[PDB]
Amino acid sequence: HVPGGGSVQIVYKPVDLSKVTSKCGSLGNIHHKPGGGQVEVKSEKLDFK
Amino acid sequence: NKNSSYFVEWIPNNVKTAVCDIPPRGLKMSATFIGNSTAIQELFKRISEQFTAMFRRKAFLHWYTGEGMDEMEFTEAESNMNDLVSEYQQYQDATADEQGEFEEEGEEDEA
């Protein structure tokens, strides 16, 4: 007989962050909205016709 | 007369007086001030820049939409806000002096 055991394997496994996916509201934007209307439309020059 | 730079030029005689017989307890005379100025455009700019800082990135919005708002409701309130702060700047540096009028252009030929 040959004594000294057979063989036994270690428990060890590789690791990864799985390309995981979540929500982001901030990622959906790069630009701001244009301004409101700064201009008068009511004014009249009061000509006596 | 002292503040001609801070009264609007197309509004003559800007002040509404009132002169009550009865001053507050303890004061021999007093007065309540009330002013409507283009200067308040700095409250509305401050609100709306601080609003955009939460809003454009959608900070704390789930607390409002979770009650039942939508982004549209924010959009209607922002559309009013951008109009109201513009309605200030529309009257800032507006004058009593008259603006001209124009014709149309767009025509040319060989000679």
Swiss-Prot record, chain A:
Positions of modified residues (N6-acetyllysine): 13, 19, 23, 33, 45, 49
Residues bearing PTM Phosphoserine: 7, 26
Ranges: Tau/MAP repeats: 8-38
Positions bearing carbohydrate: 49
Protein's cellular compartments: Cytoplasm, Cytosol; Cell membrane; Cytoplasm, Cytoskeleton; Cell projection, Axon
Tissue spec: Expressed in neurons. Isoform PNS-tau is expressed in the peripheral nervous system while the others are expressed in the central nervous system.
Covalent cross-link site, Glycyl lysine isopeptide (Lys-Gly) (interchain with G-Cter in ubiquitin): 13, 19, 23, 33, 45, 49
Residues annotated with N6,N6-dimethyllysine modification: 13
Domain notes: The tau/MAP repeat binds to tubulin. Type I isoforms contain 3 repeats while type II isoforms contain 4 repeats.
Disease in which the protein is involved: In Alzheimer disease, the neuronal cytoskeleton in the brain is progressively disrupted and replaced by tangles of paired helical filaments (PHF) and straight filaments, mainly composed of hyperphosphorylated forms of TAU (PHF-TAU or AD P-TAU). O-GlcNAcylation is greatly reduced in Alzheimer disease brain cerebral cortex leading to an increase in TAU/MAPT phosphorylations.
Subunit structure: Interacts with MARK1, MARK2, MARK3 and MARK4. Interacts with PSMC2 through SQSTM1. Interacts with SQSTM1 when polyubiquitinated. Interacts with FKBP4. Binds to CSNK1D. Interacts with SGK1. Interacts with PIN1. Interacts with LRRK2. Interacts with LRP1, leading to endocytosis; this interaction is reduced in the presence of LRPAP1/RAP.
Physiological role: Promotes microtubule assembly and stability, and might be involved in the establishment and maintenance of neuronal polarity. The C-terminus binds axonal microtubules while the N-terminus binds neural plasma membrane components, suggesting that tau functions as a linker protein between both. Axonal polarity is predetermined by TAU/MAPT localization (in the neuronal cell) in the domain of the cell body defined by the centrosome. The short isoforms allow plasticity of the cytoskeleton whereas the longer isoforms may preferentially play a role in its stabilization.
Protein's UniProt name: Microtubule-associated protein tau
Gene: MAPT
Residues of the full protein shown: 616 to 664 of 758
Swiss-Prot record, chain B:
Record localization: Cytoplasm, Cytoskeleton
Location of region: Disordered: 90-111
Biased composition (Acidic residues): 95-111
Keywords: Acetylation, Cytoplasm, Cytoskeleton, GTP-binding, Isopeptide bond, Magnesium, Metal-binding, Methylation, Microtubule, Nucleotide-binding, Phosphoprotein, Ubl conjugation
Paired cysteines (S-S): none
Molecular functions per Gene Ontology: GTP binding; GTPase activity; metal ion binding; structural constituent of cytoskeleton
Modified residues (5-glutamyl polyglutamate): 104
Assembly, per entry: Dimer of alpha and beta chains. A typical microtubule is a hollow water-filled tube with an outer diameter of 25 nm and an inner diameter of 15 nM. Alpha-beta heterodimers associate head-to-tail to form protofilaments running lengthwise along the microtubule wall with the beta-tubulin subunit facing the microtubule plus end conferring a structural polarity. Microtubules usually have 13 protofilaments but different protofilament numbers can be found in some organisms and specialized cells. Interacts with NCKAP5L.
Similarity remark: Belongs to the tubulin family.
Note: The highly acidic C-terminal region may bind cations such as calcium. Pig brain contains at least two forms of this protein.
Function: Tubulin is the major constituent of microtubules, a cylinder consisting of laterally associated linear protofilaments composed of alpha- and beta-tubulin heterodimers. Microtubules grow by the addition of GTP-tubulin dimers to the microtubule end, where a stabilizing cap forms. Below the cap, tubulin dimers are in GDP-bound state, owing to GTPase activity of alpha-tubulin.
The name this protein goes by in its record: Tubulin beta chain
UniProt source species: Sus scrofa (Pig)
The organism's taxonomic lineage, starting at the top: Eukaryota, Metazoa, Chordata, Craniata, Vertebrata
Residues of the full protein shown: 335 to 445 of 445
